[PDB]
């Protein structure tokens, strides 16, 4: 079975630094089959070689006896292990800009898992130059096949929003809610101490920002824009995404709490460094996150557990690897 | 006067472990007339002999002078007595499974009472084999007569939900809110210490789980399913029912508070073991519950009082004997 | 100018103890003109002589310099004075029952005032025997004239509710929201210590109920019923009205707070006994209340001030003299 | 490009003390270009000479490095400077009344700015005598041109509200929400200690009212009325505006918090006297305010920062220079 990834292209295209993004959420597959799963593309644009490389993850799972009706003596516990994951959406510093000038795609996937099954979400970031050739491509991810379909919308220059064409910025002024996708870029630096700005933007009891994760989020808005670096103090679009990421960390019911839990991240930690909540339910939100209390990014994969993403206390928390939401942008309709 | 109990049957039936359930809420009858009241059925499936047996209840009533306009010197008090109740929905361990293999029905009633009148709710759990003979039956409960009516819905295999047929699980994926009925099964065991899981799933200040009631809930979903044991950690449907039971204990206005009260459960208790709220109003929620702070189940019958079912403090609380609500199930429409 | 007071009568009338009530809210009149204002009726049913008698009130007003833009040195203060008010809705014990057997009306008025103007609300309680003669009457209250108009609704026995006829109690069961009017009856007695029941029904920090006002509320529901004594523990209709009175004391925007204030009730009190809130705005809620902390009822008239009617702390509070609202009653539509 | 300022006039006009007001919000202009910006009118009514005079402002800006993705080592700071602003809506005592008797207009502007751009809002208060000549005028404000357009509505005497004509006060009684514009008049006086009334009307922890700003607000309601002095204790319209000003100080999304900040007002203050919140976003609310903790009005201009206008703690707060909102007025429709 094949699934479609629609990437919208306007009639008028500006070349220079614009990248477009498409995504598709795939049906659930067993957790064991996600090992060594990597995107395999057949487009004329070679995928970036760094995405297929290994990223060390700390895998956190929960387990228990769980007999019918059993509420006690379950031996409910969490297990931390070091695992190698390839193809996840771990973007490196200046990878999007280099991929634009190299005409290379960025094809990666997110994992939304419970204890037994995973919903992969395949992402592809391609330069705007893919909006003229518009050659249909085929991507293989595990047992699934994805057809990249470029569609030329009836919009002249803007974004297709509910059958209307909105130009983020010559009509009258208007505000539109525009979709945005963000990825955390792990990069050490004295200017990238992220939680120093988390402490200023939000009512966050967050001490010791010197020892917390360093990096920034990079975002694509409207499915077609220049990359937005988050946070950027004098860029209100960037600060809107910053607000959305930390006020809605799972992104913008089948979820029942099994119990709270703590885990060692990484596995070699002398004490528990991450708080999580074990749950039962169909896969929903991402299982990929980054440990807060480590300058060097410790990537976490917690199938069946929701890591603590609330920032009101930075203790034993995490930040999401990917984030999707809506931000309000000024402009006009055409 | 006769009342109908509709039990829906699909055109395609799977035999193996499926049981169907029907219920009907009967008009109010005086409290004194509910004594020795037992279901009397005329079906081809003999009712389970254990339901008509005696279950010891602690009866908690409230009383006062209550002259017109009298607000003081009412001698407002509660009285605890040991009473024998037959035919209430007290299911034993593995009773539903044995009744399936024996082709026996489980006919029982719940009591929703105020100080003077009771609304009986008659339940019947029959094996799926009653969805082919579909012989109309007659059940007598006190002054009421109930006609069991099996109706073959136009659904192929699924459940009739608002004129649509939903198959809980080959169309597209969808989520549907499905009705569910649950009964507390009292059974001693080191794996059935229920409040050990209540403490983990909910923000519940609940100490000393060793001395609290032991057992599990058994549920039928969609009016047609295999029994669901609650809680089951790796069964998200079971954990959804678990969440609904303890977040909405009365199930999913004519109710005025007369005053808080405490009662000895059982009557021989040296101190008060249960907190309740005396009320005035037409009968609404169930008057049957089980004392929390006793490993051996102490069944409580409190006409005119609502027992403390909130779990945020397990002190002097109770759990419901029966629970009806809605849970979200994955599947498709046919 | 003349105003209408519609009193609805059903086609079928039950004689025995039923009284009907009508009311009309009159336009604002200057506060000084309300002195010695008494209802003057021209019906064939003589008004009860006790209503036109004097009831001692403690009058609480507020004053200040109040120059344009003046926010300081206003000398904002309250003044307590003993005044004689006639014709207000001060019902005596068993007055409604005696008026029924005597075929006498109870004609009285409520006062909703700000600092300068008053909205009188004229009430009339007549026995059900006024629903057959149905002779149109004329009542004079100050500068206003009121025509009592009896209208035979198309209802057989029930109450006209939104064009439908509801019979509070042979159709199917249903719940209807029914209008109700209540009056506080001041009567000393060891069974009428009202706040002893306020403490039990509501989460009310209310100590020393021995020294608080004694009496009960008497109510007419549906504009046609036997009198309902409030509170009556085993009468859920009575307890619904009890709940409405103390949860919605002003009854079931042009109101700006000038400032909190305390007053001596009665004027001879050695210290402040009542808390109030001075306001500016068009007349809205009643200015008549009864002091809480005095077994002998101290009637309060506070034009331009809202007395503390919240019961969460009984300190320096009051209770309303009259209350209008809605309660849910069981019955059927005809 | 020219923008319209519509000023509605009724068919019947009452001369005596009525003034009408119009306003227009202009597109954003760079912050540097707002210096020395003054309204230049071409009407037959000369603008009041005091508006074009200099008012000393304390200018509070925020700055930081703000590289793409930079969250730390931004050197985020605020800078206070003394600047001269002409033409802002700083009304003097009795200026509106003197302008009425002198047939002079009051033309001024408000500034809603972020760190880089400003939205000017041009106001004009003219005597009611401008509703007969109705000569179209031209006003120049910076790079913008404004055409004053007087329109004779189809209302006889009232205000045009959603296509209907409401007469604030011979039809039936009714309540209408009416627009109102208010300006803070700074005037020293023992009767103008504003926060003495703020403390009484609102639950405000506000000590030391002797050392807080002195003055009052002056308002025009319905775009046509006699001036309303705020607060006026016995004027419920005035107290409604008083409530709206302090409950909705910004008046009756593109706003992301960069961080809290404190500033010295005036620049010569030995310690920080004003709390603000630095933000990023398109210009929205006014950047003009008055320092609370100084009897002599200290006008503040904080482009890109929202001054603390919440009154629950008067510490380091401010009050708005201008306020627009809605108040409920009694009257009738014609
Ligand atoms: C995990 O998700 C799958 C697919 O939705 C579901 O079938 C399975 O029961 C889930 N496991 C849990 C909730 O433990
Ligand atoms: C109990 O319920 C019956 C039936 O609804 C009602 O008639 C009776 O008044 C109630 N008793 C109370 C509320 O004390
Ligand atoms: C009192 O009410 C009258 C009538 O609504 C009104 O005209 C008057 O201004 C009010 N006085 C106040 C609010 O002080
Ligand atoms: C200020 O507002 C202008 C106009 O809306 C906008 O272009 C600019 O980015 C804003 N500056 C910020 C938010 O720092």
Numbering used by the authors:
A (entry chain A), B (entry chain A), C (entry chain A), D (entry chain A): 21 to 189, 198 to 280, 290 to 371
What does the published report state?
The outer membrane of the hantavirus envelope displays a lattice of two glycoproteins, Gn and Gc, which orchestrate host cell recognition and entry. The hantaviral envelope comprises a lipid bilayer with an outer proteinaceous shell of two glycoproteins, Gn and Gc, which are synthesized as a single polyprotein precursor (GPC). Fitting of the PUUV Gn ectodomain crystal structure into a low-resolution reconstruction of the mature hantaviral glycoprotein spike complex revealed that the Gn is membrane distal and likely shields hydrophobic fusion loops on the Gc. Following receptor recognition, hantaviruses undergo clathrin-mediated endocytosis, and the viral genome is delivered into the cytoplasm following Gc-mediated fusion of viral and host membranes, a process triggered by the acidic pH of late endosomes or lysosomes.
